Each structure stands twice: as C-alpha cells, then as structure tokens.
Scaffold this active site. Structure first.
Site, short mmCIF file in Angstrom:
data_model
loop_
_atom_site.label_atom_id
_atom_site.label_comp_id
_atom_site.label_asym_id
_atom_site.label_seq_id
_atom_site.Cartn_x
_atom_site.Cartn_y
_atom_site.Cartn_z
N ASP B 48 1.01 -1.74 -0.01
CA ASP B 48 0.04 0.40 -0.34
C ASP B 48 0.46 0.95 0.11
O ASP B 48 1.54 0.95 0.90
CB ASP B 48 -0.92 -0.43 0.77
CG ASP B 48 -2.25 0.62 1.35
OD1 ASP B 48 -2.25 1.51 0.25
OD2 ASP B 48 -3.40 0.36 0.70
N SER B 99 -7.12 4.88 -1.22
CA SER B 99 -6.72 3.24 -1.58
C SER B 99 -8.12 2.56 -2.02
O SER B 99 -8.14 1.41 -2.33
CB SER B 99 -6.69 3.34 -0.21
OG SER B 99 -5.66 3.70 0.00
N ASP B 150 -10.50 -2.42 6.34
CA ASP B 150 -9.99 -1.04 5.32
C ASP B 150 -9.86 -1.34 3.97
O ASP B 150 -10.44 -1.76 3.49
CB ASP B 150 -8.41 -1.44 5.57
CG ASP B 150 -7.69 0.09 5.32
OD1 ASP B 150 -8.23 0.62 5.41
OD2 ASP B 150 -6.29 0.02 5.32
N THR B 152 -8.27 -2.23 1.39
CA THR B 152 -7.53 -2.95 0.63
C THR B 152 -8.19 -3.60 0.53
O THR B 152 -8.81 -5.04 -1.05
CB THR B 152 -6.19 -3.01 0.63
OG1 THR B 152 -5.31 -1.59 0.88
CG2 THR B 152 -5.69 -3.13 -0.36
N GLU B 319 -1.90 -8.80 1.60
CA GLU B 319 -0.73 -6.70 1.03
C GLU B 319 -0.12 -6.24 2.90
O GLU B 319 -0.63 -6.41 3.60
CB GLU B 319 -2.02 -5.94 1.52
CG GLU B 319 -2.30 -4.07 1.00
CD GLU B 319 -3.43 -3.81 1.63
OE1 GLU B 319 -4.19 -4.52 2.36
OE2 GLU B 319 -3.03 -2.23 1.54
N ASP B 324 1.89 2.53 4.04
CA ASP B 324 1.61 3.09 3.69
C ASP B 324 1.42 3.92 5.09
O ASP B 324 1.11 5.43 4.56
CB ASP B 324 -0.26 2.86 3.32
CG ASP B 324 -1.13 4.26 2.81
OD1 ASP B 324 -0.85 5.25 2.01
OD2 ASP B 324 -2.09 4.60 3.60
N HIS B 328 2.23 8.06 5.87
CA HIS B 328 1.17 8.49 5.79
C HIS B 328 1.67 9.71 7.51
O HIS B 328 2.02 10.57 7.04
CB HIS B 328 -0.59 8.34 6.43
CG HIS B 328 -0.70 8.42 4.84
ND1 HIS B 328 -1.04 9.65 4.39
CD2 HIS B 328 -1.13 6.72 4.37
CE1 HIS B 328 -2.14 8.86 3.07
NE2 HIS B 328 -2.42 7.47 3.81
N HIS B 409 -0.50 11.16 -0.47
CA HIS B 409 -0.74 10.03 -2.05
C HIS B 409 -0.08 11.08 -2.80
O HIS B 409 -0.67 12.30 -3.13
CB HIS B 409 -1.94 9.72 -2.34
CG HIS B 409 -2.19 8.63 -1.33
ND1 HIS B 409 -3.20 7.72 -1.30
CD2 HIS B 409 -2.29 8.34 0.11
CE1 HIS B 409 -4.14 7.15 -0.44
NE2 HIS B 409 -2.56 7.07 0.19
#
Ligand code: ZN
Ligand code: ZN
Ligand code: ZN
Ligand code: ZN
Ligand code: ZN
Ligand code: ZN
Lengths: 446, 446
Positions: B48, B99, B150, B152, B319, B324, B328, B409
């Site tokens: 991610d 995402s 989440d 994904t 995943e 990710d 962040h 992103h």
C-alpha cells in the site's frame, strides 16, 4: 518488432473496461520484440530529471489521464534502474546523484562522484561510449537543447575533475590539472573540439568566445579554432537544413543559442499555496521559441539523416535538457513542455528504427526529480500550482524538497524503456552502469 | 521460467563494471519467461503506497544501494501503470487516488470515485475478481496486515458507497442505502461475512464486536454470527498453525489484532530540519511485534498451504498494509520495515510458484506516496530524517507534500512486476483496471 501503436484508454473511462489500455494478451507481441541480433545503430534519448512522476504529469496535462504519448510510452520493453553516485572521500554510495555523475555512469560504465565527468573517484580518465564507437569506425552524434558544456553532452567527450570547467578561464581555476597551460587535456569545450564527433548540435555559443591560453590555437577564440579545424559551423535552422554531409573531414557543429535553447511553453512559477490562492494555469507557447530555432525533433531528424550515410553504423545521444532546469525552477509549464518536446524526438527516433530494423532505441532519465502530483485541495509547505489539463480538469503539482531557490533531484529508481536488438537488457531491475555495457555489446564494440 | 536469482551489484562499486547488476545478455532468459498457457492460480501482492521511491529507500537502507531484494526485485517482467480515479460529479479523471478507488479498479475493472468500494460512479455494484473466482469453483484467500475493513481487502468482498461503512453503526449513518435495516446488502464486515472466502487473515477484530441491527443474526455480535455461520475463528499464530483445512464448509477467519497488526520496526518520526538538527537514525525492531502474532510471510505461507488443497486452483490477495500508514505518518523506519516485511511474503510466494509452475505472481502498489530520497545537506520545508544505511552511509528521507498531520498520496505511475503464465500483460504502460482483465483471463474466468 512491433512498437506499441496505442495504449490509450480504449473507451469510456467511466464504464467497465473503458479505462483499459490493452485489448488483448501481449505474450505474442513481447515474443516478437526479443532479438539478440547485433545492433547496427543506437539512439539513446535522455529526459533530464524525467522520472516516472515527470512522465505522468506531462501525460495528464497534454494527453489526459487515459492518453498515450506516441513516443515516450510506445517502447515495449521497460524496467527500472538505480542511479546512485559515490562519495569521493569514502567510496560509499551517495544516494542522490547530480547530472555529471550519472552521465559518466552510462557513458563509461563506472560509478563516480557528483560533479565529475569522464573520470572515476581516483580522477582517472575512462573511455566514453562515444570515443569507443568512433574508434570503431561508427558515426557519432551528440545532440542536446542545453548548452553543450553542460554535463549530459559534456560527458561523452570530456574528462575533467569538475563539471564547471566549461572553457579556459573556469578550467584554470577549477581544474588546474586539466588546464591546457598546466599541461592537461583541456577544458570541456576544448575537449569537445578534440573529440570531433561527426554531429554535435545544441546551445552554449557563449563559451566558444574564449581564447586558448596555450597550444596550437593559442590566443584564438574556440570558435576560430573550430573553423580552423574544419568544423562546419551552423547557427540556425535554415543553415542547419542546408547541411548535406557530415563526417570526420567535415564535422558539423551547431550552436543555436548563447546558453540553453529556448523553452517551449511559458507559465508562472509555482508558489506557496498556489493551488488555493491562485486560479488554474493553462500553459502558453513561448513566442520566442522561433522558427529560426530548430526544435529537438528537427535536430534529431537531421542528425539521423546525416549519421545514417555511414555504412558502418552510428551512435547518437539526444537530450531533452530543460525538463530538469524547469523542475529546479518549480515551473510546471516549462517542465511539461520540455517533456512534450522530448516525446516528438522519441517519435522521430522510433520511425527510423521501425523502418531500419537494426536500431536500439532507449529512452530514460539520468535521475529522478522534485515534482509530485498531489490532490487539488492539498495545503503544502512548499510550492504548488493548479493546471487545467487536457481532460478539462484540475491537476495540482507540488515541489517541496528545498527551501533554497532550486528544487532538488531525488533518489528514486526510474523507468528505462527500449526497442530493438538487445532491448531485453533494460527489463527488470538494472543499474545505470549496466546501460554502458548493453550499448557496448549491442554495438559489438570491443 | 526463471526468477532473477541475483541482480545485486556484481563487485566493487568503485571499479569499472563493479556496480553492474547484469552478467550477460538477458534475451534468452526473457524468452523463457513468456508463456500464455493458463494460470491455475494467482497470488497478487500489494504494497500500500509502495511506489518506486518507497522501494528504493527500503532497498538502500536494508540491502544497500547495490543490494537486491530477493522477493520484490526478482520478478522478471516489469512495467508501469496508471492509477487515476474519477470525479463522482463530473466523470473527469481525479489524478490522485485513495486506496478505495484503486483497489476497486483492479478488483472489478472499472474506475470509480475516491471512497467507493466495489461500485462505480453511479453507485452500481460490480463483481469482484474474488466473487468471480469463487463462482468458478476456485479457492479464495484475502490476507492483510491492516484491519480487514480497510479498503484494500474490503474491496474484494464489499460494495458500499463509502469505505467508512465498517460495521452496522457507521453504515447506518454513512451508507443508509447499504444499511441492513434499510434493506441494503449490509456494512463492509457483514458483506465480508457473506462473501465467505476460504481464507481471510488480518486485523480488525474491533468491528466484529458490533451487533446486527436486522436480519437473521439480529442483535448478535458479528463475531457470534461468524461462529454461528461455520467460520473457524483463530486469533494467534499457534492456533493459526493448527489449522489443517479451510473451505466453503469450514471457512477460516483470523483476526490477529483489534486494529492494524503491529508494525515491524520502530523509529522516531521525521521532523523539520531533522537531518540537520538531529543525528542519524538506526531503525529498531518493535519489541511488541510478538511471536504469537504471525508475520505477513507466515500468514501467506499458511494461506498457500490451505488454498493449494483445492484441485481447481486459487486466487489469493496479500497486502503489506502498513507501508502506506507509516508514509502518512512520516516515519521512515516504520515505512521501511513494512516493505522488508512485504519482501518476505513475496519470497514465500515466488518459491511456491517456481515449483508449482502454473502460478501468476504479481507485485505492485495501489498508488504512489509522499516520501522522496534527497541529498544529505538538504534544507527542506517539510519533514526530514537522516538514516544510517546498511552501506554504512547516510540517506536522507523527505516528506513535504502536506502541512496537515498526514502526508499525502501522489499521482505518479509506478512499478508492476509479475512472474509466470501471462505476466507479459504487465510489461510497458498499462492501467490498473487492466490488471482485473489480466487476472480474469489468466484464470480463464468467464
Ligand atoms: Zn540531471
Ligand atoms: Zn542535462
Ligand atoms: Zn538538475
Ligand atoms: Zn493505499
Ligand atoms: Zn490498504
Ligand atoms: Zn494512504
């Protein structure tokens, strides 16, 4: 050997299957792109600072998100390569390279320190792919939109301890050991003049106004030296168009600007909160680009016409230089225009290759850069600008990696794409020094 | 079909040829990698926010600049793909995707708006690759280090107008039309429960504590509904290890954390002028990661053992979620550790594929992220940190695209690599929705 004729979104991007870029299985096409037969010629296109981010923003603006660059995006064998430099003192990796160290990497096959051209960390000279192709009897060309003393094209014909040793005066104080009066090979320009490539086109007329401090052409400007050595001097598109032959006896030298050739598009510079505060920008064509100034696609077409007369084959390096300058300047329209400009040259290179059948075309960049595509409502610490794209939507670009006047290069690995005999050697992960070897072997230089 | 066994710098990176990653021509190897024979199974690995920058930073730190990731960097067919979203109102491209919209793209083949899951801009559901593989009789697995609600993983089994519709309470107010009491298909968790994949591992136990507001299992927690519907609930490594079968009759559900599973490495967060002001950082293993908590490589290995019992074949999505989040958070060590963590799972995947022979392995990311590799002496406007790499040198990372608490992103196109039957379909430029069609056809799902 197929060229990707069209990888644009195939339909209505809002419907199922509409955003697809493929229309069928690619195995067979990829099988038809593999060939280890020798390469008669090689055309290497370099986007300066043109990393994956630069390619994506340029595409979004000019062709739309689902658009396709007929040049840049058409190469079928792609990969990613690393371009780290070395610390001169320690010999350890230096994660973010300058343009001189990377250029030296693909042109000699040896890693080096930032600011070095054609030498290693021990300051030892190493033959460039150009000098070797020439020694082998092939024609050679070096084309760029930058001043010819800049690192990208300088690296094919000069070996100096510092990229700033443009001409005589800078060399004497920046590169005392390379200085002609001190018994060295000479400044970048003097070395370019000795390397004698058949075709050399670009800007940088300014330095040629200096005068040798020693040697045969002492006291004469480097321009006088060029004429005196038999070079065909040309300075505009018309005279450039007139040229019918270019060789070792009649080498061509085109100086189309005092410094870097004019940029293709104009636009304001990014600013703090620019996407919030200011309205969206539409790029405008630079009314000073001129029809007396050959375009990069024009310089490339001429170079190919001339170099192809050599039955033996050729080596040509073409460079979209200002992409990197405009990125440093935080100017989206200038950055994107030089990417569009580069794509036109890539197309003229593929067309020839496609017909000729023995040409290796390679498109890549020396290192990655500062720009990032971020959300429209982003509130960033750096410089940003909103642009009205081809799709009729807003794209926001951001440069936030320096508080200094210039945005900085970045270390990320980036795209390498190729077409023709031996292009398989760019697929997967590779190192920029690998490109020297791929080219050396594709051409069979020994 | 070869796997790149070693693309590390071949020797002394300071000498000629020492930084090379190739040892010879790859034409023949690439030829042996092309096959259009059907894929019996497909293992999709998602990092991610794992853009080329994330992969490079992680390699430099853990393996050195001339290093090689035995998992991530070993896939031989590579390319780049676009992942732009769509504006719900206009239907125009939205250059930076969240995402939810990207995941929906590869799982349904249709572009959508940020926040959407399994529906288009018209809020119409579309079958996911998992629902389809299942209808076809193949086993299906959905693994992740994030909470299962989440985006994904949610995207393979839920269709809601907003990703925030985790369970009953959120759905009622965020997705009234998906709400069970309002007669819709239900919240993300409830829909996961109905989708009934054979193997589902990850975090997110918290939401299963809610109680249906309608339907058969009304007033029961989603945990109770799971046991009642025949799911094998597991919550630690040991109990996960005990599992010997997983199927439609005995579906497996591993909830290993209330939220996201724990991150592998700890380090301080980047700060303003961090590389100048503060000393260099060496990442440290998280002493709370725990041997009772299965690692991503373990969750993957188990999923493969169980799903491979199905003679028909399987589809598995794996995943590395926290890459990710850490990005962040502007936390280099956390971001890097989850990339190394992801590499471990990729190796487990290649090993199986290599022996099995009919398995398509794909490793890619949903979108690009904020982090950039900048010069050591950079004076940036955002957050930066200097790390001591495995090369015994300093690498500086920079996050500078937001003034908000979270780094954003970015829209840049990024790497996609595959191995096995049909991997040619990821070479060159493609679109994220093309990955849905590639998998759909490789499996021959109709
Ligand atoms: Zn450069
Ligand atoms: Zn340059
Ligand atoms: Zn630069
Ligand atoms: Zn994501
Ligand atoms: Zn995720
Ligand atoms: Zn994110």
């Amino acid at each position: 050997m197929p060229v990707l004729e069209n990888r644009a979104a195939q339909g209505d991007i809002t419907a199922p299957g509409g955003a697809r870029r493929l229309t069928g299985d690619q195995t067979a096409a990829l099988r038809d792109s593999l060939s280890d037969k020798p390469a008669k010629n090689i055309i290497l296109l370099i986007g300066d600072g043109m990393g994956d981010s630069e390619i994506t923003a340029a595409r979004n603006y000019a062709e739309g998100a689902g658009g396709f660059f007929k040049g840049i995006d058409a190469l079928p064998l792609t990969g990613q390569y690393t371009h780290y430099a070395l610390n001169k003192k320690t010999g350890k990796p230096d994660y973010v390279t300058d343009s001189a160290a990377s250029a030296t990497a693909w042109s000699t096959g040896v890693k080096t320190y930032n600011g070095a051209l054609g030498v290693d960390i021990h300051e030892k000279d190493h033959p460039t792919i150009l000098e070797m192709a020439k020694a082998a009897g092939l024609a050679t060309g070096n084309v760029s939109t930058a001043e010819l003393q800049d690192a990208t094209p300088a690296a094919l014909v000069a070996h100096v301890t510092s990229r700033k040793c443009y001409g005589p005066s800078a060399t004497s104080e920046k590169c005392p050991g390379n200085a002609l009066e001190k018994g060295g090979k000479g400044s970048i320009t003097e070395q370019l003049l000795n390397a004698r490539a058949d075709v050399t086109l670009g800007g940088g007329a300014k330095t040629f106004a200096e005068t040798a401090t020693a040697g045969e052409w002492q006291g004469k400007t480097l321009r006088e030296q060029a004429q005196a050595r038999g070079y065909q001097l040309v300075s505009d598109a018309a005279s450039l168009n007139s040229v019918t032959e270019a060789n070792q006896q009649k080498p061509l030298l085109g100086l189309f600007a005092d410094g870097n050739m004019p940029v293709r598009w104009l636009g304001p510079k990014a600013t703090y909160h620019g996407n919030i505060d200011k309205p969206a920008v539409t790029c405008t064509p630079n009314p000073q680009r001129n029809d007396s100034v050959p375009t990069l696609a024009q310089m490339t077409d001429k170079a190919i016409e001339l170099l192809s007369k050599n039955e033996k084959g050729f080596f040509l390096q073409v460079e979209g230089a200002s992409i990197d300058h405009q990125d440093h300047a935080a100017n989206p329209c200038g950055q994107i225009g030089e990417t569009v400009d580069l794509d036109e040259a890539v197309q003229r290179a593929l067309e020839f290759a496609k017909k000729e059948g023995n040409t290796l075309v390679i498109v890549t960049a020396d290192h990655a850069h500062a720009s990032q595509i971020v959300a429209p409502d982003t509130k960033a610490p750096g410089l940003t600008q909103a642009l009205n794209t081809k799709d009729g939507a807003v794209m926001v670009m951001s440069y936030g990696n320096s508080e200094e006047d210039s945005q900085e290069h970045t270390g990320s690995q980036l795209r390498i794409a190729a077409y023709g005999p031996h292009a398989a050697n760019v697929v997967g992960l590779t190192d920029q020094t690998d490109l020297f070897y791929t080219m050396k072997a594709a051409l069979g230089l020994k």
